[PDB]
Amino acid sequence: DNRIKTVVILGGGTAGWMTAAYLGKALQNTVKIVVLEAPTIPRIGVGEATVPNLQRAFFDYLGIPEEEWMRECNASYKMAVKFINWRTPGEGSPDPRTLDDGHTDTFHHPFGLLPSADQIPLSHYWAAKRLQGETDENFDEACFADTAIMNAKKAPRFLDMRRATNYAWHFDASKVAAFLRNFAVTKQAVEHVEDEMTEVLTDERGFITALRTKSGRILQGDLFVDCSGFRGLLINKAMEEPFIDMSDHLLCNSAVATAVPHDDEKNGVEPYTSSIAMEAGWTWKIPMLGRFGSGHVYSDHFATQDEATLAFSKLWGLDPDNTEFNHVRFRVGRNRRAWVRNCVSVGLASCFVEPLESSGIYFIYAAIHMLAKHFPDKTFDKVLVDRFNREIEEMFDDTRDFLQAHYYFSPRVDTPFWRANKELKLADSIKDKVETYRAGLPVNLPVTDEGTYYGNFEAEFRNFWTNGSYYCIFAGLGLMPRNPLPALAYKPQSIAEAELLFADVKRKGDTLVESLPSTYDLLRQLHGAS
Amino acid sequence: MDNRIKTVVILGGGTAGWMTAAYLGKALQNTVKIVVLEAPTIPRIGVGEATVPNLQRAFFDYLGIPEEEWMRECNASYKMAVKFINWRTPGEGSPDPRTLDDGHTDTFHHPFGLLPSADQIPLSHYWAAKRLQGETDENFDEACFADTAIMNAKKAPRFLDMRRATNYAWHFDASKVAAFLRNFAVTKQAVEHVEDEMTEVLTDERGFITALRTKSGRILQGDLFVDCSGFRGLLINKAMEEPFIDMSDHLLCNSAVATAVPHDDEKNGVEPYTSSIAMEAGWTWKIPMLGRFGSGHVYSDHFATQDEATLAFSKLWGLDPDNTEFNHVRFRVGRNRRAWVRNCVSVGLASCFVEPLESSGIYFIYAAIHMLAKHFPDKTFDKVLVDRFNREIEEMFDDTRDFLQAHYYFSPRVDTPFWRANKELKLADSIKDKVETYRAGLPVNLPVTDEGTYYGNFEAEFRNFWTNGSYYCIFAGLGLMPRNPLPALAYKPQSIAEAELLFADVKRKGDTLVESLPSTYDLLRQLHGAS
Ligand SMILES: N[C@@H](Cc1c[nH]c2ccccc12)C(=O)O
Ligand SMILES: N[C@@H](Cc1c[nH]c2ccccc12)C(=O)O
């Protein structure tokens, strides 16, 4: 037995309690787990978005039924990120402007995988017609039935809780953290130490030996997980790991946020996250029953905090001198190495991007998954540490690049912020993808059906942003292949087979818009709200 | 404004030419003219060729050709693995395995399929923990694949009622498959078969091929040229001047001598596997078919003269050299700098080649034609289409080159100059990195799909052709072990217990299928209708 005997987790919230609950299950009670969490007040009433795998990879793994946790954190349903005013100039508005072709300036980024004909994804048949002037229809409407469901504000489940389509979650992050704290402590023997850390003790080879607390207790441990946030109190402050600032890829570094109560009865509830474009950034809208979380992500180089606060407030018609705000300074980038010696960073302590495509919870889950996969013993085999690190850096940079493309290919040039994005360089990896996409080839072609993709985290992790996602953003923003996929010009039978798939999308969207409940109605039932 | 390719000309027949022609016959939906230029071919000995499981799904099903139909026309038999005999022990070649110092025969299998997992960890890792901690005496192949038991009994991968029992692939006479596909393409896809010799490759001011001149006087116009001319690469290397990258710094064998050996099936049964029988200056393949097996001694002509190698090959099988028909081949091992250049796409040996240690030949052809259809161009030859095709071929090839190198690099044999010379070669960075991952006890190329998807969708398998299970078969088979168990297993007593159920499953499937399956021989006699 040269095994890890105690794991000490610094920090609560989602990172700390997801780590704690996950390792509780994965390590089968053979290790003592400690969470050191200073007592704390949540800033807002705010919300957070997730991706489809969360129930299966995380909550199902812990034996936690979906509705149980959803009832304890006022969770709502998400079928996409919906992008608003990303192609057109001017002051932020919650309502879409009009493109030349007469379409609203909106595009959706839904979940699921596109169907193929003759091994060619439906996207490619749509781009063919579009480039050959045989359709005016937009990509999201043509290729995803879920677009029609979201436009109608219908739910992803019928009233009888039968599944209609793919989806993920909006929730109050404070409540999920509290739910998981309760689960960890009462079902998994986690020691919750409610105290502030006052010192990190390290031996001579630079391994952490214990955390000192203000009350005087010394929490010994063998492995330490830094879930302390942007301060990186173990990984950066104690281990002295450099952070790599990546503002040369993404300009937004700040947010001003609040919870907006909302007339659900009057407006319905939107089953999607919104990205509402602003002059020096964007604003998120994350609906839950009774209120929506919202924040204006911005670059402090192009808007002062006061300018942001005023434009944020104007967008929602809020009284700026009479609203509660949470002002956040983002650290954008990742550590040079996520895991150093016996210190593993998870969450904001590890790495961070603006929540433009719901990265936060997923980054946490992926690290925890990878830490269990590469779980060490006390020798801390350097190969295990390196392979963990490679996964995390590939994960992060891939998503960083993907986000950068949202800005780089926006056709907006109306403010210095929007023009400045285009003076940045795209990383080599995403420049290559764009070149592939421009030639009409697929990018990151899905090779599995949806059951396997969302059934096995390793399949999804290997191909997180699929061809369908690259089409959602590039074609939503107006970036098109130079010409159709050339193979299509030889495949008249395949083009016909694709027309059946297009008709399938129309029909499913039609029938489900008829049969589905409103998201409002589904939530009133799920949360028993009078 | 119409820049479509209208004519495809394929130089060369054989498997490469006729698979390319039949496949594009389907893929281009009769919108292109397809021309195959092939010299009148003299019969060759069916020295036998092995395959991998995807061939029926990806290639024959795709064309609407039933498995039994082509097999009955190609003297095909069944393959459940490659089996390595005497790769760990010294001495002259023998078909019979020598005895290791632990009393086992010197054999290890490389079967198909994907290993199951418990708690997301492959069964291999549970076997390795037990092996390293003195808790099992069983070899990796016997512990983790039921197919090992089935092969040891020479049972078939199907029941007589033709229900599938396990994974498998095919042994066939390569000439008969080319003849079969030629007939198909000529009679059902209107391919123009020009039976004639090429005398000149015509090129324009851009370096693009415009036509192939033939001895009879045809000038075969084309828009796209596929080079299936073999090792001489008459289009890709000679006309297009693309250099070939010799890779003898990773694999030493460069030669083969081969023959077909009539076989007493009744007495001996038929082995449902390819054998790789280690020799002093290389190895010898055994590829069973009905009534005979194809065999070939692969060797380096630096360590064995042709005559020396022929004599050793004859002695292995008890053949009389002056009553035996031999086929002699000098390989070109490695790949072109670029597989596709301008309007010339190389396929088969004209593109790249390794010795058939893990049955790569047909697989490389199929993979290239799949990728050609996917990247099919128009007359503008978008440089990005060309480049992405080349990237897939080079990655496919170097990955396999490296896997093959590991067979030799990790052989403990030191008894001849050949076996020692392999271990003075360097491992490429990619495979070194995998070995380091493996030695830490971590998975290598973890399977992320079930077999249905993996074998149902070529692109799934192409993204992960050599999975964790394959690396274990070769590394553990040769005796390279992790430095220590996967360390996560020290914390997972419940997962270890599930894996015990998985080891039980393997034993149960092996016990019950060996009792219930028919011999390979008997299933072959039923399939082929033998008297
Ligand atoms: N792998 C993600 C891709 C995805 C699609 N739409 C998204 C919106 C937000 C974030 C991720 C996504 C998934 O299928 O779930
Ligand atoms: N992807 C191949 C890998 C493989 C396993 N065993 C083999 C033996 C020979 C050649 C390839 C293989 C398959 O599963 O079919």
Residue numbers in the entry:
A (entry chain B): 2 to 531
B (entry chain A): 1 to 531
What is the paper's account of this structure, in its own sentences?
FDHs belong to the class of two-component flavin-dependent monooxygenases which require a reductase component to generate reduced FAD (FADH−) for a halogenase (monooxygenase) component to catalyze halogenation.
Structures of Thal and various FDHs including PrnA and PyrH were overlaid and analyzed. Moreover, the halogenation sites of the substrate are all placed next to the side-chain of Lys79. We noticed that the space between the tryptophan substrate and Lys79 was confined by the surrounding residues in the pocket and were not large enough to accommodate the larger sphere of the iodide species. The tight space between the halogenation site of tryptophan and the residues lining the binding pockets would not allow HOI to be accommodated. These data clearly explain the results in the HOX formation section which show that although HOI can be formed at the flavin site, iodination of tryptophan cannot occur because of the limited space in the tryptophan binding site. We believe that future efforts to widen the substrate binding site may allow some tryptophan halogenases such as Thal to catalyze the iodination reaction.
